[PDB]
């Protein structure tokens, strides 16, 4: 007949494997079925004896623990995991990674921003929040996301890892913590350097090489919005700014220091994006391309187009402002 | 948190294995989830590579094809499948049957009453309905349930067998057809005789022996209401009498004969149930017990209690009907 929304159609199931997937077309229920499909499809349910019902509860609990922020919400979570999913396919990651690593990658992606408050680490630290005090100023947000992820997993009804022997649990947990903590942008240069270092003569047998690679992969997915089609990507930039502005406005009010890139009276969307794409996104994806050449066509291409589009957009903006004076 | 109904709680999943499960507490969605869980739990999704999403679309389509009769509806379908599932564990059937047999048993239980009109074969035949004409008075309803079952599986989106090699499909199809046709009570004596004949020296390696055992298994589940707790079983009896009175009514105003056990003025519920329990249910489960001894305490027991309760009800009922005269 005509099946409910939570029963993905075979077209959806197919499109889900590509970075082109339009993440705005679905409601939480549908997004949850997509995430559920990914675990079955990647063979994770199979290889780790994941109780199919526990998987649904775990995903619903994860969903319940994401806040209603303009950017750091459940839909962003879906994007990251969905891009990680596309990359497993595009790069044929199952050929180079064990199932244990694929599991670490996917679960970390889904949990990386759990219970995000909507104010970055700088705000937590300057305002001396409970999180900043709890984590001694060390990546308070990322530490918290990871802690909430394991508190959820510690709930028996949500423990998708219930049938994994303790030695495997330890390995997975250590892997997730490492990846989630690797998403704090304050460590971007640091991580990128370590990767590029190993990249000179990459060894898929070297555990430290693989760890860095996995860190780079989750970082890619986390800030992979601009890799998506222009219509899918643009709205996210507005959501992010909306969140940054809310923070700066609050910092202005409470008398805390304000970061220029988050100040309403200073940031112009186009100009800012150009710098981000040009000096953060493109460079990072170029390094990944050396290992997975198919990335250039599938992900570097859209990044270049985005850079161009925004560079043009700025010219139009400058001329417009130049004319108003 | 507090999950939606379609997410079975771990308590429900546990209960689903026992014949004491309360089949009335659930809405189609929860029942659909239960059936899905059964296919994963028994290892069918795993061993036959059933696409987990197709499994759900299929269950939804099956549901859509059951009518809103008072007895022969989707909830009856859930009962039979659930009793079958319970029997698998009670009798440790996976030690005696292959996964293909289990798949045959489970899928046949679920499909055995598809698109039932609410009027039995005797009516179809006597009224010379389209079905009786189509199937030449040979188990018309059962033949139809079968046909519908395979028209459904013919739809790609609902074909839970799409990944089974053709030889496996044929074996499964043959098996399901045999079990569904075996539910026609007109053949009850025939089948019980043939089974008891083989029972004189049962051979688990003899294919004919196993065929009859599976037919007895599905017949057992099909009419196993009285095995369930009294609170669960009695409402089913009333639901059936509702259809029976609907038929006997229509048969009288059409000039077609009426089966005494369906005649309101002869079918004192208690007297009819006592007979059914004593000469159909008990004898059947009795022979099955000789093969699986544990069946006596778990299913033959409640049948005795049930037979005894209806006998008490009969006394009080006849007394009150004497005043009505
Ligand atoms: C600041 C944004 C661009 C941007 N997009 C991100 O996803 C992101 C993640 N972290 N950061 C970030 C945060 C703080 C400091 C530096 C950066 Cl790079 C980001 N900056 C814009 F240019 F306005 F569009
Ligand atoms: C129809 C009832 C007897 C009876 N009791 C059941 O619990 C039960 C379960 N399934 N069936 C059943 C349903 C459809 C066709 C045949 C049967 Cl046998 C039953 N029939 C009576 F005769 F009125 F007392
Ligand atoms: Mg984060
Ligand atoms: Mg029937
Ligand atoms: Zn993020
Ligand atoms: Zn039936």
Numbering used by the authors:
A (entry chain B), B (entry chain A): 181 to 505
Sentences from the paper on this structure:
Cyclic nucleotide phosphodiesterases (PDEs) hydrolyze the second messengers cAMP and cGMP, and play crucial roles in many physiological processes. PDE molecules contain an N-terminal regulatory domain and a conserved catalytic domain at the C-terminus. To understand the roles of the invariant glutamine, we mutated Gln453 of PDE9A2 to glutamic acid (PDE9Q453E) and its stabilizing residue Glu406 to alanine, and measured the kinetic parameters of the mutants. In addition, we performed molecular dynamics (MD) simulations on the mutants and determined the crystal structures of PDE9Q453E in complex with the inhibitors 3-isobutyl-1-methylxanthine (IBMX) and (S)-BAY73-6691.
In the Q453E mutant structure, the side chain of Glu453 rotated about 15°. This movement made a distance of 3.8 Å from OE2 of Glu453 to O4 of (S)-BAY73-6691, and 3.2 Å to OE1 of Glu406. The 3.2 Å distance between two electron-rich oxygen atoms may cause energetically unfavored repulsion. A possible explanation may be that Glu406 is protonated, as discussed in the section on MD simulations. In the PDE9Q453E-(S)-BAY73-6691 structure, the conformation and position of (S)-BAY73-6691 to chain A was clearly defined by the electron density maps of (2Fo - Fc) and (Fo - Fc). However, the electron density in chain B had the quality only to reveal the binding location but not the accurate conformation of the inhibitor. In chain A, the pyrazolo-pyrimidine ring of (S)-BAY73-6691 stacked against the phenyl ring of Phe456 and its N5 atom formed a hydrogen bond with OE1 of Glu453. In chain B, (S)-BAY73-6691 formed no hydrogen bond with Glu453, but with Tyr424, although its pyrazolo-pyrimidine ring remained stacked against Phe456. The IC50 value of (S)-BAY73-6691 for the PDE9Q453E mutant was >160 µM, which is >1800 fold to IC50 of 86 nM for the wild type enzyme. However, since the selective PDE9 inhibitor (S)-BAY73-6691 fits tightly to the binding pocket, the Q453E mutation would cause a net loss of the hydrogen bond and thus impact on the binding affinity.
